[PDB]
Amino acid sequence: SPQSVRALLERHGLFADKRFGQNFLVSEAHLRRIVEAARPFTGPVFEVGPGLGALTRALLEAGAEVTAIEKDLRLRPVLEETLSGLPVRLVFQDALLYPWEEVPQGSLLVANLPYHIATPLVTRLLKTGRFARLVFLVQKEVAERMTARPKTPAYGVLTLRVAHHAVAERLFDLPPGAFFPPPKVWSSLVRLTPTGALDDPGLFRLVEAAFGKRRKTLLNALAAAGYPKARVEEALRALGLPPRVRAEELDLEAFRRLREGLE
Ligand SMILES: CSC[C@H]1O[C@@H](n2cnc3c(N)ncnc32)[C@H](O)[C@@H]1O
C-alpha cells in the first residue's frame, strides 16, 4: 500500500530525501517480480539501498543470504524493525565505496538502486566479473540504454559496456506509482547475466572515442580523438563499412573487430 509506506515513514519520523534518491517500493507484486527475476539464490546476495527493508525481507524469506548496504543512517531504526529476527548483514556505508572486487564469485546483486549511482555502480560490478546475475530497478531511460540495439537514440557507450560483460533483459516497466514518493519518470526491472569478460580498457577507449563527438562520422570522431585517420579508413574498409558510417551503426562484435583491425 502507498498508505502503509507513507504511514511507516510517518511513524519513524522519516521523509524521503532527494539527496539519497529515495523512492521506496510500495507493491508486493513488484517485490515478487524482482525476487522471481533473481532466483535461484545460488550465491550471496548484495542489496544496495534497502530503504525500508521491503525487498530485503522478501529476499530473506526466499532463503537468500543477504548483505544490505544503506548510506542513510536515519533508516537504521526502520530497517532493524522491518528485519527483526532475520539474518541480514546491514552495512551503513556509501555503496560506491564498498569493496566490490572482493565479493565471492557467484554473488548476486538485487536492488532498488538510487538513480544517481546506478550507472557507475553497475559498471563497476560488471568489471569485477564476480556476479552470476544482477537484477535491479533503474529509470526507464537507463534501462533502454542498457538494452539498446544499434542505430537507436538509446544506443551508446553504456549499451556497449553492458553487452561486453553480459546479456541484458528489460523484464518489466514500473509506473511512478510503484514508489513512494513517486518519481517523475517510469522505471524498469533489468536483469544482467555476466558472460565472462572482464574489463577491456583498449576496447572502451575506442568505444568512448567513437561516441565522444556525436555530430561526426565514426572516422572523424576517432580521428579527433587521436586515432590515425588512414588506419581508421582502412579498418572500416576491411569491415565492409561505408566511409561515413556512424558509431551507433556498429554492434559489439563490429567494435571488437574494429579494435583488432586498428591494432
Ligand atoms: C530507490 S531508493 C534508494 C535507496 O538507496 C539508498 N542510497 C542512496 N544512495 C546510496 C549510496 N551511495 N549507497 C547506498 N545506499 C544508497 C537510499 O537511501 C535509499 O534507501
Swiss-Prot record:
Keyword Methyltransferase attached: yes
Top EC class for this record: transferase
EC number: 2.1.1.182
Location relative to the cell: Cytoplasm
GO CC field: cytosol
Keywords: Cytoplasm, Methyltransferase, RNA-binding, rRNA processing, S-adenosyl-L-methionine, Transferase
UniProt: S-adenosyl-L-methionine binding residues: N23, L25, G49, E70, D94, N112
Protein name: Ribosomal RNA small subunit methyltransferase A
Organism: Thermus thermophilus (strain ATCC 27634 / DSM 579 / HB8)
Gene from which this protein is expressed: rsmA
